[PDB]
Amino acid sequence: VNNTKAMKHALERVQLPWKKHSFQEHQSVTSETNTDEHIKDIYDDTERELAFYKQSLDAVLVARDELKRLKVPFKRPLDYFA
């Protein structure tokens, strides 16, 4: 309990070869905002529905830098539905 030790060697044990490659596998980026900011009322749902609203917004923007740059893009094919 409260154990960082086995939590650390579990950091070494579980981690994926993310150090060893590019971005093309999981596609999860660490954002700059902590989103514990600008929430004045924890009870407010749409306050951090705004916060994460712009968090997946901006995340997927810069990730569109990625995926124009990684040459698999985002946008759902609207030519095909299946």
Added chain:
Amino acid sequence: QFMNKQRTLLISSRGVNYRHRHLIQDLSGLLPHSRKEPKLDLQQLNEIAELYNCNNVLFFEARKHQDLYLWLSKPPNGPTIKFYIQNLHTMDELNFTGNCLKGSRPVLSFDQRFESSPHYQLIKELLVHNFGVPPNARKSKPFIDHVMSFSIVDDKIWVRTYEISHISLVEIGPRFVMTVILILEGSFGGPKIYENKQYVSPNVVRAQIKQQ
């Protein structure tokens, strides 16, 4: 081929609901690299990982048709995040409008605060493996469809998904309110490695109410 490869076993407990069944609908159809199995104590799971040969394991507990504990690990080694869900918003709500092409690999938004403690680094990792769709999981389609995020609301920590409209979005989900109850040694084994006392199991709050 590909660096990252996952498969996930999907088994919940007895005493299922439409909160439950709606959830197994979503999450089962969300993980195109996952295997889906009948429902079933604590030992045999890592062995089912041997039979169907699966590298990612999770489990949905039902107590009194209330407590949903998600056990989480990657067998036999794990380790496990024992988990509890509240305020479940699945995909099936009227105000979640989406219709998502199948099998896609989302893009995950998440807060940098997790790394500030190592256990959130590990729920980070184990979830990146388990729910992260390895490109490209067989049955999928290329490009991208939806975004899924996770982060901390007073250590009660949502995950969500938006369908993208070419960048606009409207939430797919399942909108999900996450906790971390206790981390255990391996996959379904060992002493309790990390606890959050923040959580008080609703059975326990009943144990308070009875005493007036």
Added chain:
Amino acid sequence: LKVPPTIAQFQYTLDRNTAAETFKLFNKYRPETAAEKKERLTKEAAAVAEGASPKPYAVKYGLNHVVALIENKKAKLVLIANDVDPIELVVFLPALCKKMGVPYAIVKGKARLGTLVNQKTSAVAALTEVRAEDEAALAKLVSTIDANFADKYDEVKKHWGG
């Protein structure tokens, strides 16, 4: 149709002669008729009403009773019909006696067994302890069913018939 090895072990029965012999024996042992018990118990009724019991003998024929004699084990020879309305009933006897080393013998017809017993049918009738008179005829009899039936008929255990 092809029939399972555990069946078609019926249809292999005792010959004209050996059967004939078996009944040469049991026809001594007819379990006494009803009017019989009424007889003896009436005469003794009057006797002890006004005016030393060797153990009675018969063949022990109750199906439940019979399987009961086996597994103890008690019995010596068992006679099993080839035709039971729910053919199910007896399917396990020829195996059972087998594993228990009991002389089971398939004799044809349930009327034919049923008639020696004062009934319409038996499908199983068997005996264990016999009077000393025929004890030799017993030892030889079971030796004859061993020798006839048992010996060369191990084959029936495999080989779907039909």
Added chain:
Amino acid sequence: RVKVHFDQAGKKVSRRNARATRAAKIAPRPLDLLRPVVRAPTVKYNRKVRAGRGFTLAEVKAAGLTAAYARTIGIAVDHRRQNRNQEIFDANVQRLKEYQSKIIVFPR
């Protein structure tokens, strides 16, 4: 739909009468059956003590009589109940011993 009980006056008169016949035959006996003294569950009520169903096998034994006879002497027995609390057990046993000492029985 709406049922409105205007017989709460009369039903109690017929219930008095019922008990008035049930004692018009059984007359010496007391309409009733001895019954244990039984603590209630559920942290709320556990401090209270209660009437139960029947005594038990064991409580009947150690009180010096046998079940099948008890039921016919006026006792009432419950075979699915499990004696644990010493004290409750005691009060029960006592209560029987009492009952014994107070009864009579007629001959045949």
Added chain:
Amino acid sequence: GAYKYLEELQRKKQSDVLRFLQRVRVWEYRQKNVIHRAARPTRPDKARRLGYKAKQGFVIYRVRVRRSLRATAEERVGRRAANLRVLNSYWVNQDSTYKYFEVILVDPQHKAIRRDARYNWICDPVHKHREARGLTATGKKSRGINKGHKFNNTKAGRRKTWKRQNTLSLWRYRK
């Protein structure tokens, strides 16, 4: 006694012998009426165990249902033999396009079973046509009656529990 041998077998219905006996006996049945009496159980086990006796007064029919069921079985015989009270029934054999059930009845009029305190109770009038009202082994399974939270629907009746659960009742001196 046999019967542990019988059942300890009968628990295996995909076995080879039972396979065969199945395929035969279904064929035979199919060649006869929809309600065809038998004088003898097929399986004497579940005969005894459901309370068949072998004696005068007990009747065994056998009904072939299309493809609830076991209740339907109960019905058509029920309509057919109107003197006999039903008792119980069970499952022998199944065609592809039919299940075959076989059904245990008792003659109320038959003065050999109007005695016999164990079985005489069925002669009392409240048991006429028990099958139509669903009082039987499966009859009470469909109604969903047993003990538990698993049924708080009905331990008495759906019509019952709902009728009395929403209607408002007043005392005299009001509450």
Added chain:
Amino acid sequence: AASNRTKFVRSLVREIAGLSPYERRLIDLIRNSGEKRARKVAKKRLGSFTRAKAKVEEMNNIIAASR
């Protein structure tokens, strides 16, 4: 506990009954593949990994007891 009467009876009737084809394929791909696809398809036909045990183990005990 069980009285060894019934242990006997089960043991026996299991031999007298003949083997449903599930058993047949189980023993089959045990004598060919073995436990892997065994418990695979057994659990897949039957209920659970509690109930894949009874059958699959039972099978190996029968081969080694078919000696």
Added chain:
RNA sequence: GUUUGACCUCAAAUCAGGUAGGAGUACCCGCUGAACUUAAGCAUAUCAAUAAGCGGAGGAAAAGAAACCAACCGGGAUUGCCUUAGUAACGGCGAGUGAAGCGGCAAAAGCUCAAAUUUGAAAUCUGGUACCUUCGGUGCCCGAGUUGUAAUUUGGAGAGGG
């Protein structure tokens, strides 16, 4: 031995003894099951797991001696009532929908089967028939019945002997 007989299966009878149907249907047990309307004429819900319909009994029916509740110093078949309670929970979290244990009290009741051999004995039962004391008894004869009638036991155990 080409006869003769037993058992099975299935018939048939103007043979005897029975028995079922219809009427009523307030109540109760099942199956089927709408719309007005409410909610925005709404796809849900609602109205309603109702009404008309079909099947079946009784003075009650139905349910009933835990594969129960519980989580505590444990209650102990059902049904009913006051109460938990408009509470938990369900809610385009909308109309609104909506429980159960505990507690008090009425009335209180327990039990049968199958699963071990009667083996030194079917000890059981229908019917017929004669007499009698006839809502029945006894003698006699068939018949059922050993593919199991009677006794013993139902986990609250139990059995055999001493």
Added chain:
RNA sequence: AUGGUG
């Protein structure tokens, strides 16, 4: 809407 008489 239900069930009925023409």
